[PDB]
């Protein structure tokens, strides 16, 4: 697997692919 | 955090895996 | 707004839209 | 849960807010 | 709902989610 | 090019691709 | 309409241009 | 317009709703 | 990671994720 | 081929690496 | 068809739409 | 190449067609 430069919705798509049915949490800094 | 890192900088699928439930 | 079917990667795109900076969790086994 | 609210059945943008942190 | 920073195709995805079966028009400046 | 099935958010992505700056309308009830 | 041309049935990129402004 | 605003600046889902048919 | 169903544009998004700069081929007739 | 490995049947991220250059 | 400014995954989505069942190769420079 | 061109600069669907199999 290669390293990733992921902003915005593109990060969430990646988390989705990586985690599958496990699901994930998306937690940006405030 | 991961959100930022991934965007300002690069991150790996292995780092992303830590955010799975 | 509307009600539609939102599945898989489309469902997480919609979560990112609605929640954004708040963050969210996607936990399909729940 | 979320899949059986908005995917299997349909749901609104407001219902999706139920899953924000 | 949170505010949105949306460029390119990401705007169209948002319009799609927001409008549903109503549909929408996408009208950029020329 | 080709003919394929284009539905939902994929259909609007394809409209954005083809029309771009011209703009477009997505009016599924029509 | 567009759904019953490219989604239900199939359509080309050229047919999609029918829906540009 | 909305297209630009959303990109140069931020916009809300409520502003986007005005472009629904 | 997981195993899930990856089709169409979602399958190519996943290829782009995994392969990135290496590049990839998407050859469904194969 | 790829469609009948990850779409029709299911496949892992590692199996997807089979299709990198 | 209009000209395109496409980076990252957005290029792959475009290649997907344009090529259909023919498939495509994605070959970035190294 | 195409990948770069499309991103640094603009490209057409017709140029993209050259990368189909
Ligand atoms: Cl972007
Ligand atoms: Cl689907
Ligand atoms: Zn993007
Ligand atoms: Zn889809």
Swiss-Prot record, chains B, D, G, H, J, L:
Protein's name in the database: Insulin A chain
Phylogenetic placement of the source organism: Eukaryota, Metazoa, Chordata, Craniata, Vertebrata
Species name: Homo sapiens (Human)
Gene: INS
Disulfide bridges in this chain: 6-11
């Amino acid at each position: 697997f290669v390293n990733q430069h992921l902003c915005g919705s593109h990060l969430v798509e990646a988390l989705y692919l990586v985690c599958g049915e496990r699901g994930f949490f998306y937690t940006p800094k405030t | 955090g991961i959100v930022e890192q991934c965007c300002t900088s690069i991150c790996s699928l292995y780092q992303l895996e830590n955010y799975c439930n």
